[PDB]
Amino acid sequence: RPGGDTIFGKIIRKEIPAKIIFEDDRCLAFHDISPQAPTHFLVIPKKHISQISVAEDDDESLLGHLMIVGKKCAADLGLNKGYRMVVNEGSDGGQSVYHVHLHVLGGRQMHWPPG
Amino acid sequence: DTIFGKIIRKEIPAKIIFEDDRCLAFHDISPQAPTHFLVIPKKHISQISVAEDDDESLLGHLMIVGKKCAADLGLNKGYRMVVNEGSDGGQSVYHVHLHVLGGRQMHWPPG
Ligand SMILES: O=C(CCc1c[nH]c2ccccc12)NS(=O)(=O)OC[C@H]1O[C@@H](n2cnc3c2ncn2ccnc32)[C@H](O)[C@@H]1O
């Protein structure tokens, strides 16, 4: 099944409901169900890539597209004071869903270090 | 101009990890993890919010360079990539830069 069978693949195929902000042929943005900030959403590719460490060189445009969609969605959600984008890889990153995705967090002051 | 422009122009020293014709990776001067480096484009994009659609391949290139550098630096148990935007994101230099942090457990929330 296209997109795979992680929760995000199910969300891509509208088999699991999500609060979808934006959708095009390459990606989907939707709100996180355990938000770590007042606004916290995810941008995921529709192509299944399990994690950033295995992305191919020709995935560059798709990965960049996630960030462009992320900043567009942040603007449309009114995050005029800024936001933080996060990609988690593997165990030390805390990755819990092995479908590559971009977190976008805002609506409060983000602190340093970023975890 | 910013201090990262000076680094690109080789006017001040940096611990450079990787360079090609469109980006540069170097260790952060104020590291927050055992491994903490930055990937920056040579094109001066001040912040991710002003990036254009024509920049998408370049931004993806930063991430691919980032993950290749992380593998080269031995980050085989994972890592976290971070881009900050604006005041609430805590952006410190107004030149787009991707943080890559690893070598310890990264926690949640991410700041
Ligand atoms: O999960 C982490 C760090 C967390 C974390 C937990 N403990 C830690 C310890 C250290 C570092 C990170 C962590 N790393 S992660 O990159 O894979 O993020 C996946 C994201 O996917 C979210 N999620 C899961 N099911 C859903 C969802 N969002 C929307 N839905 C709609 C329907 N169903 C969902 C989930 O809440 C999380 O924010």
Swiss-Prot record, chain B:
* Membrane-crossing residue ranges in chain numbering: none
Q: Any idea which positions bind AMP?
A: 28-29, 84, 90-92, 97-99
Write down the Gene3D superfamilies for this protein, in alphabetical order.
Answer: HIT-like
- PTM-bearing positions, type Phosphoserine: 30, 57
- State which Enzyme Commission number(s) the record gives: 3.9.1.-, 3.4.22.-
HIT domain location is 3-111
What's the reported outcome of changing residue 82 to D? Answer: Loss of dimerization. Strongly reduced adenosine 5'-monophosphoramidase activity. A 110-fold increased affinity for 3-indolepropionic acyl-adenylate and a 100-fold increased affinity for tryptamine adenosine phosphoramidate monoester
Q: Return the motif ranges for Histidine triad motif.
A: 95-99
Recorded consequence of changing residue 29 to W: Approximately 30-fold increased affinity for tryptamine adenosine phosphoramidate
Question: What happens on changing residue 28 to N?
Answer: Approximately 50-fold increased affinity for tryptamine adenosine phosphoramidate
The record lists the catalysed reaction(s) as: adenosine 5'-phosphoramidate + H2O = AMP + NH4(+)
Tell me what the record says results from residue 29 to F: Approximately 10-fold increased affinity for tryptamine adenosine phosphoramidate
Q: Where is the active site?
A: 97
List GO BP terms, alphabetically: intrinsic apoptotic signaling pathway by p53 class mediator; positive regulation of calcium-mediated signaling; protein desumoylation; proteolysis; purine ribonucleotide catabolic process; regulation of DNA-templated transcription; signal transduction
Name the Pfam families on file.
HIT
Q: Which residues form the signal peptide?
A: none
UniProt-recorded Gene Ontology molecular function terms: adenosine 5'-monophosphoramidase activity; deSUMOylase activity; hydrolase activity; nucleotide binding; protein kinase C binding
Where in the cell is the protein located? Cytoplasm; Nucleus
Question: Any idea which UniProt keywords this protein has?
Answer: Acetylation, Apoptosis, Cytoplasm, Disease variant, Hydrolase, Neuropathy, Nucleotide-binding, Nucleus, Phosphoprotein, Protease, Thiol protease, Transcription, Transcription regulation, Ubl conjugation pathway
Q: Which residues carry this modification: N6-acetyllysine?
A: 6, 15
User: What disorder is listed for this protein?
Assistant: Neuromyotonia and axonal neuropathy, autosomal recessive: An autosomal recessive neurologic disorder characterized by onset in the first or second decade of a peripheral axonal neuropathy predominantly affecting motor more than sensory nerves. The axonal neuropathy is reminiscent of Charcot-Marie-Tooth disease type 2 and distal hereditary motor neuropathy. Individuals with NMAN also have delayed muscle relaxation and action myotonia associated with neuromyotonic discharges on needle EMG resulting from hyperexcitability of the peripheral nerves.
Report the sequence similarity comment from the record. Answer: Belongs to the HINT family.
PANTHER family for this protein: HISTIDINE TRIAD HIT PROTEIN (PTHR23089)
Record note on quaternary structure: Homodimer. Interacts with CDK7. Interacts with RUVBL1 and RUVBL2 and is associated with the LEF1/TCF1-CTNNB1 complex and with a KAT5 histone acetyltransferase complex. Identified in a complex with MITF and CTNNB1. Interacts with CDC34 and RBX1, and is part of a SCF (SKP2-CUL1-F-box protein) E3 ubiquitin-protein ligase complex. Interacts with SUMO1, SUMO2 and RGS17. Interacts with the Ten-1 ICD form of TENM1. Interacts with CALM1; interaction increases in the presence of calcium ions.
Name-wise, this protein is Adenosine 5'-monophosphoramidase HINT1
